[PDB]
Design a binder for this molecule. Structure first.
Ligand SMILES: Nc1nc2c(ncn2[C@@H]2O[C@H](COP(=O)(O)OP(=O)(O)OP(=O)(O)O)[C@@H](O)[C@H]2O)c(=O)[nH]1
Ligand SMILES: [Mg+2]
Ligand code: NA
Length: 343
């Protein structure tokens, strides 16, 4: 059960204080404009985007020029979350689902109250994480090269920008120390297993994003439990219940482990008790496009974990957000399964 056909795409949740750039970072990677469409310019829902490893390899090429860094994951599911204070429930749900995370910190502001909240979530679950120290283009006099690696661009800055960067970096490290986290600028980190790496980024210029992407793959491959690199028993969670044109009442689901198939008999929790139904359509967005955004869906016979899927099935009207979802297998009893989800 440790073969290429059995590889699992892990889950990375992005967390941070409001307006720190979490969505803008993902828009730069995806080449989308989700943030410009958001009411108030704020995220109000959990979003999910799947990144195939081919795309991650291309977007890290400028910090892997000789092609030698070994990519072992087949891809990565990235869960976007709200930073606004009123959405603590959704940060908790996203954090609960992830295997690794990116914590976004505005380099201009340092740690802020929902950063502290997010650090509590990360500590509680022992989640490996990297920090995107974002908005470096706001360093006064920053000269950009679009989508460059951070070190190459940093070497081209004037002495004032380099000094400002180091002063802000040192302040942020002291703040993380006050919260009980040792942190290092990523290329100064000699203990990747225990110290938090700080990777400076700009979602506007793209700089440092190649470093950030390489680092989250390294988190998957070198800090996450190895067993999570491979598919095991199905695990899935309902995110939302949504009525959709043509498909009727659907559920959006994070498939955390295992494999879902069209036609599967599924059991989940409903307002009046267990719901048992069959998957009529098993849908995803296009790769590198958001689950939380209306678009044309791709229909699949099979979806391997992790992914964000939309399921069309009769009888989903009472489904409960946060419910687990099970599949009735050949040796399962359908009625016995209903209780298991129940408790
Ligand atoms: N100058 C600069 N502005 C940025 C950067 N990243 C984000 N912004 C701006 O900061 C504002 C907030 O960006 P968002 O992507 O909404 O941040 P967020 O963390 O997703 O916000 P919530 O999901 O609402 O918590 C927007 O106006 C962005 O254009 C950056 O690297 N540099
Ligand atoms: Mg956002
Ligand atoms: Na925002």
């Amino acid at each position: 059960h440790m073969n290429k056909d059995n590889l699992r795409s892990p889950i990375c949740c992005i967390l941070g204080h409001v307006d720190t750039g979490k969505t803008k970072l993902l828009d730069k990677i995806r080449q989308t404009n989700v943030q410009e469409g958001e009411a108030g310019g704020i995220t109000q829902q959990i979003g999910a985007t799947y990144f195939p490893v081919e795309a991650i390899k291309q977007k890290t090429a400028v910090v892997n020029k000789d092609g030698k860094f070994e990519f072992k994951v087949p891809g990565l599911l990235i869960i976007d979350t709200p930073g606004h204070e009123s959405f603590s429930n959704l940060r908790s749900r996203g954090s609960s689902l992830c295997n690794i995370a990116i914590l976004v910190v505005d380099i201009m502001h340092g740690l802020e109250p929902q950063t502290i909240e997010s650090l509590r979530l990360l500590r509680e679950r022992k989640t490996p994480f990297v920090v995107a120290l974002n908005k470096i283009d706001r360093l006064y006099g920053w000269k950009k090269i679009e989508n460059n690696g951070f070190r190459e661009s940093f070497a081209l800055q004037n002495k004032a920008v380099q000094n400002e960067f180091r002063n802000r970096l040192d302040q942020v490290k002291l703040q993380f120390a006050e919260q009980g986290f040792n942190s290092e600028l990523f290329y100064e980190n000699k203990n990747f297993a225990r110290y938090v790496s700080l990777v400076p980024t700009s979602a506007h210029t793209g700089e440092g994003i190649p470093d950030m992407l390489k680092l989250i793959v390294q988190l998957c491959q070198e800090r996450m439990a190895s067993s999570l690199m491979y598919l095991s028993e199905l695990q899935a969670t309902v995110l939302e219940v949504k009525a959709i044109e043509g498909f009727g009442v659907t559920i959006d689901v994070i498939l955390s482990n295992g494999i879902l198939r069209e036609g599967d008999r599924i059991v989940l929790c409903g307002l009046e008790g267990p719901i048992k139904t069959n998957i009529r359509a098993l849908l995803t967005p296009a790769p590198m496009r958001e689950l939380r955004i209306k678009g044309q869906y791709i229909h699949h016979k099979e979806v391997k974990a992790a992914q964000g899927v939309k399921i069309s099935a009769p009888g989903l009207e009472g489904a409960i957000a946060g419910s687990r979802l099970l599949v009735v297998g050949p040796d399962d009893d359908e009625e016995e399964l209903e209780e298991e989800v129940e408790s």
